[PDB]
Amino acid sequence: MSLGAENSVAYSNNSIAIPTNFTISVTTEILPVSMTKTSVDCTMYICGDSTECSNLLLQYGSFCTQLKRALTGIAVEQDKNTQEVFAQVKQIYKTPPIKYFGGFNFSQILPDPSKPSKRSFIEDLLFNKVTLADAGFIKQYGDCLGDIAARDLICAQKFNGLTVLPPLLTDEMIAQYTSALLAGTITSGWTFGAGAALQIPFAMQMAYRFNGIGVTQNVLYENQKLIANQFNSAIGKIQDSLSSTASALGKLQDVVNHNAQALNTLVKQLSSKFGAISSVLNDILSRLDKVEAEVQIDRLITGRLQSLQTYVTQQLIRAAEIRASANLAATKMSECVLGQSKRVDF
Amino acid sequence: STECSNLLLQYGSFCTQLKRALTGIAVEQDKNTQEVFAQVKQIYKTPPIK
Amino acid sequence: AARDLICAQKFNGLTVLPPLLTDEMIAQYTSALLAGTITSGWTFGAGAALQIPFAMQMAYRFNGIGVTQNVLYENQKLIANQFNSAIGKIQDSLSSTASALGKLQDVVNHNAQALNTLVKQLSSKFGAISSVLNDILSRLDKVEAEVQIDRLITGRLQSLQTYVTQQLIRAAEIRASANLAATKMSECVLGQSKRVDF
Amino acid sequence: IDRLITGRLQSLQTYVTQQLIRAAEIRASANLAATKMSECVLGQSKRVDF
Amino acid sequence: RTQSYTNSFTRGVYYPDKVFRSSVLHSTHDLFLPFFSNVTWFHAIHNPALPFNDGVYFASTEKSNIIRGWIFGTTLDSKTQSLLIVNNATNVVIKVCEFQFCNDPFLDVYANNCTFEYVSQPFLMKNLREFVFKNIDGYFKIYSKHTPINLERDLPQGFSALEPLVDLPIGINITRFQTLLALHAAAYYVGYLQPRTFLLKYNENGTITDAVDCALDPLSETKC
Amino acid sequence: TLKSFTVEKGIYQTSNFRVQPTESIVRFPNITNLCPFHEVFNATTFASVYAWNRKRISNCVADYSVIYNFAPFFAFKCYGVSPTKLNDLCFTNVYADSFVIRGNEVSQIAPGQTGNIADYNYKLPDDFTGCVIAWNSNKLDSKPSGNYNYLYRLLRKSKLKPFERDISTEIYQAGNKPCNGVAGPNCYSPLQSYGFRPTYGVGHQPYRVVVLSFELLHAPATVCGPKKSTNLVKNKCVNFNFNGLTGTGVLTESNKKFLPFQQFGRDIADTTDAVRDPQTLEILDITPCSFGGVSVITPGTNTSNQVAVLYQGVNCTEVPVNVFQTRAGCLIGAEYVNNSYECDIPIGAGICASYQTQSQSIIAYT
Ligand SMILES: *[C@@H]1O[C@H](CO)[C@@H](O)[C@H](O)[C@H]1NC(C)=O
């Protein structure tokens, strides 16, 4: 493997290098915030519509109560993550109908009223790129009851006691929060994050941004057209690279793929025998007397309980990672969008 | 042991997800090392004068 | 001589994979970062590397912390002597004291101890008549040996999943430490940090 | 007694795993509190909403 | 007789059980003919009896009743019970006892301890007939498939899943094998089954359309 | 669910609702013949160990309560099934094997055994299901002169596969010099007589053994026990009994293209999804009845005792077993208002619940 291109910077004790021009660069950072909320019914997954197995399951204590408590804590934590990332503004700001901000073009990131879900062009591309797993956040028992084509994985997950809970904030509310943050950042600057929103022209705000980084503010007032053209070209390049390349959003797709794969493995674990004569509960009930079927049912109960405990532990570890990523995203929302950062590579 | 393997096939896919978790950890270690150290674009050199 | 622990780990299905980056490549990355931060300053982290004399770079660093830059130009020999003496003191402290590098030794010790426990768990009976599998197969008929093999399989699977769970938790802790190390590389080496005690 | 031993080992291992995950969360919160002690009390911070 | 060799060309996969499965990828372990194997081409114009090595596989590119009947067993001319099948245009006679046979077993057109006798429907109604014979735990199973072809040169490139016929409880020892011819230029292929692991693909209509080996090449092990 | 006599403010996942079945369905094939279990248990002489007689039983109604009245046995040892449940469950084929062995080798008639009868005479498979019946036959199969009508193999050159029978009598060879049809040195006849006598001990008495092996497969059922078949009702949540296995679900007409040799359909989790009616040749789908989760929305006990119930993931305008429709289920007992406040109690996709004066009631809002 190659580490990089070879270079040799020319150091001298009376020589310096000073730039004579500049470029404006727009880069894209993607951070996961939340994941899929799930709830598991123990009696339907382990036994399923059976009374003897339920009476044997009640003899094991409170494993399922603490499994349900852990899943409920994860489900509350996901909504808390989304709320601490996005809900940072006190008021919903609106952009003026005039669209002149010193020659800077913000049309591809500001929303448009042509569609009922007020999302921008880049937001629409990001939503179309990530292929969802078609979770059960919308009720789908009517489609599961009607046997059409072939049986799907969602119906097989639902019939065994696994249910996906819908998030508290819809995509329209996240889009409204994003639009409010964009309107406040475009009009007021960093003043809306420290109190009331004090208006300022965008050229003078960007001149303050140049004074932040160590450049005199006359540079913008002499190169405003060049800087606006560079920003517009960078935004168009971002739109082109998001229309062309589909591998940039691999983190959110990895989150969706993991959340689907865990439930698929949990469904597939129900076909194991775990040393019993059969993996089917009713065949054990109808083929044996009381004591031998009690032994086989207890073997199946131990196996299914171990698989469910493994699923809950893996979900807890994934929720810890997602909470760390959401804390980073909330810090980046407070420090990059609501202000200007002097931290290098942040 | 063949008999142990035939009785281990009845337990499902526990070892598949154990191998998946270990492979994820092994990928994450190299991702951590590349995130920490591989930050510079080009391999700079110092001049021979010291 | 005698059977090693690594051979006992390897003979029972446990294998250690080599890292993707060798020590020479990590040393090359460290040398490139050192050469960049010695010649250029913080300019090589924000784009192209622009050269500057090192005294003028230290004057920039003194102006960053609120001290006027003529202090360095009047006490440059004293500042260089103090830096060289501090570097020599770090040399002597690393040559003498062995207690500074305890975190990395803790990582190595934990990774060895988990595998040693996983190997040592193969000698337990888990309620069966023997911990040796061939003795169970030879000493019994099919049904009874199936029962004892099921007991051994359940015990070994429980030990394996306990090992995988603690390795996942340690991986999360190591990833948090690596994220902190990447932030410290981006903010201390490629720039100057105004954060207190960072 | 073997059945009781297996059940109590499983319950104790579940308790230890939950304690380990909670200790990881408390360690993250304590690291954040130490950073806020170093940057808010011992100095003045320019970071927004910090 | 004339012996030639032909590639098996991913042919000879049967249904492993009488259970309907749709839109699923199923993995099974059973005596299967491996993919791209070395089957033997036999020309009948001329005959020692062939081995029965854990199951055999047939194909036959001819038609009518020129090929019919098989003989199973360890020895011949008594001294051991032997499985015998006679097929014609009307009936199938399956019978397991000693019988009297010459050095050339054939059926002309124009015993002592005899136990099992069996009668069912005929097997038959640009013509290939597939056959899989298996002997597991005192049970004997027949799989068959009827498929056409465009050119009569070799085995086709495709998948034709074989469906079961009968599940006979013969319960004898079968180590050698002889086929029967009708006399008043017959070609058949012989391939031997092996304990392989498969990964079968079912479509929405429940039939098997694709399968892979698991020890043919490392790509198949990756797909496993 | 909280194990306390007071509850705080919030939403709580309490229990799960399930539609209970109403009727019961038994579907068995229409057979009226009676099985010949009477013809197999009495004989003048049973067959020998090496030449055991297998009887093919099919297409009849099998009553296993008459087995007890036909022979005085004690060891009714069944392996893959219980003896008391053989009338309820159904399968496709019965084979009965009869032989007479000695009393010390009755324990060799079992799966996974090693000995003389099991290795060389009569072997049972490892995955054997069925019953083994053995009783003492000292009154009929014992003579003072010594019985020579029963034979067993002494030794063979190889082991015996399960359910394999051999008749041939060849002189055994144990060396390089061939026997050439003469039972001389290193040449022994494998057939040795038992030699039963009434003066022998209790472990050397003759025992008559009848082994029933049941085919538990996916072939169409031909022989099983007596159960009356009722009428078939569709589009109702009922309990069904199709050829032995039971379950709870609703039966609908199926468009699945079953092959003629197939009987059952299966899902990912190895549960039955489609079934074939044994009487009429039709395919029926098996899908479970209505279910879901139940959430209770309450303020504290010190505030009010009113609750609102959320039935998660159902469409209770259609099936419900102040009504508001939500993306998170449906809401009973909370009145929707066209206002907007802060979220007091979360419910789902943008909907929250509170407890205000607009007379106190639970309200729902965006
Ligand atoms: C400055 O650099 C030159 C060569 O680049 C060297 O000869 C000179 O000694 C250096 N100045 C000092 C003070 O060392």
Ligand SMILES: *[C@@H]1O[C@H](CO)[C@@H](O)[C@H](O)[C@H]1NC(C)=O
């Ligand atoms: C901003 O860009 C869009 C598309 O790139 C373009 O249609 C629009 O005219 C631009 N705005 C102005 C003021 O030119």
Ligand SMILES: *[C@@H]1O[C@H](CO)[C@@H](O)[C@H](O)[C@H]1NC(C)=O
């Ligand atoms: C089958 O084996 C024969 C043995 O000589 C060989 O000649 C022939 O090429 C083989 N067929 C193949 C590899 O397809």
Ligand SMILES: *[C@@H]1O[C@H](CO)[C@@H](O)[C@H](O)[C@H]1NC(C)=O
């Ligand atoms: C019976 O078959 C086995 C293998 O199928 C073989 O080893 C044995 O020799 C056969 N018996 C005789 C008498 O040939």
Ligand SMILES: *[C@@H]1O[C@H](CO)[C@@H](O)[C@H](O)[C@H]1NC(C)=O
């Ligand atoms: C399944 O059967 C239907 C009915 O004829 C047919 O239209 C469809 O093409 C089939 N699907 C296949 C062969 O993949």
Ligand SMILES: *[C@@H]1O[C@H](CO)[C@@H](O)[C@H](O)[C@H]1NC(C)=O
């Ligand atoms: C035994 O069964 C036969 C029918 O094969 C019957 O005639 C006879 O009466 C039975 N024996 C007794 C004691 O009833």
Ligand SMILES: *[C@@H]1O[C@H](CO)[C@@H](O)[C@H](O)[C@H]1NC(C)=O
């Ligand atoms: C059983 O019912 C089917 C359904 O009509 C019928 O075709 C068949 O003749 C019946 N069998 C008998 C023995 O009555």
Ligand SMILES: *[C@@H]1O[C@H](CO)[C@@H](O)[C@H](O)[C@H]1NC(C)=O
């Ligand atoms: C299911 O709920 C949706 C949501 O309002 C409704 O449009 C649809 O008609 C319902 N389905 C029924 C009542 O079958």
